[PDB]
Point group: D2
Chain length 115, copies 4
């Protein structure tokens, strides 16, 4: 599992559950090709998005549906979504955890890139 | 000044200076149209992107070129950029400050929205 | 104004107003001595805590009463407060902005340190 | 394991390894009683600090030695340490993960409190 996404709710101090996540790969035309998607589990985690074979070097975009999340919970959110865009390269570490910490008007994202 | 961007460097504890910022608006046909652009000043602030008259209701995307920033300082950053996408002015005109706090593998963004 | 504190509310996207802030200095005997205190203004800023003359080298602790803030707004926050502890002025006088971004179960703090 | 501490390095996008962590409980005199301590593992995690029996309601302080961390890595840090102070109460969720995300001049901390 070379790409994992983990989402936390900073208001309630919990996993952000059933958050929709879509992953895209940049195509040679520079448009965004759907690659993978899923919803975060009860632990705020989304595993099994891709495989080592499929997850080649390229520029990837991870779009987190934060607006839908806050809407279901009765909170008026600022952002339409949280976008994370990065280049996956073969030379260094290559398990990627994209972590997102969510508030109605703020989010932070952090990549933990390990062996 | 209804739209302002402030960018801080969390490694140096300083404003993040000369960071390129591009702003787009979603058009009727659902494409991103160029709206404004600029660079942060010595104070890490970017003012004057737009005017009250021009800054109508819409979905806006603020793209902060964090990669060029970190690269020019010798670091090899994780993100291509930091994108902030939001609906603006749909309860009427507001003033928006988009704050970004930058580290090589992490960033946070915050909106401060005030009533003029 | 060598020491300033700015506090933002990440739930409301607004400055965090009327937040109590207490500042202590570590004394020769290793105890925390009261140094200054105040409340954030309508802009979430707290200015005038000290002067250049008074703000000598030392280890300082800035205690932000986030609990009372969230409690008065109906939320039941996780933290008792947000503490920021730092050595000041040991390469000579600097100006310090301590920024805190607040959520009920999370906060981040950032220092912007500039050369007067 | 009702108290877990997890530390990340936002500069390198990795676990913050071998970070010293001390936990204190507030005594009735209002002084801070050493309770538990440890160093973060290779995954940035510190488990086994306490047990359900020992971890009674009270006010706890978790002190993370961030300065030593940055110093060993050649980065000039701002903070003397990162302090997290909270009340542990019996009524709601009670596994606590204290997460810290570290930069030289900034840190964020987040509590994930689950069943």
């Amino acid at each position: 599992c070379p790409l994992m996404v983990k989402v936390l709710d900073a208001v309630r101090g919990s996993p952000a559950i059933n958050v929709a996540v879509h992953v895209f790969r940049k195509a040679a035309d520079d448009t965004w090709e759907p690659f993978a998607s899923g919803k975060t589990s009860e632990s705020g985690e989304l595993h099994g998005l891709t495989t080592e074979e499929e997850f080649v070097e390229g520029i990837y975009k991870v779009e987190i549906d934060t607006k839908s999340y806050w809407k279901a919970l009765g909170s008026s959110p600022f952002h339409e979504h949280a976008e994370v865009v990065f280049t996956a390269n073969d030379s260094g570490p290559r398990r990627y955890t994209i972590a997102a910490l969510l508030s109605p008007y703020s989010y932070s994202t952090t990549a933990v890139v390990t062996n």
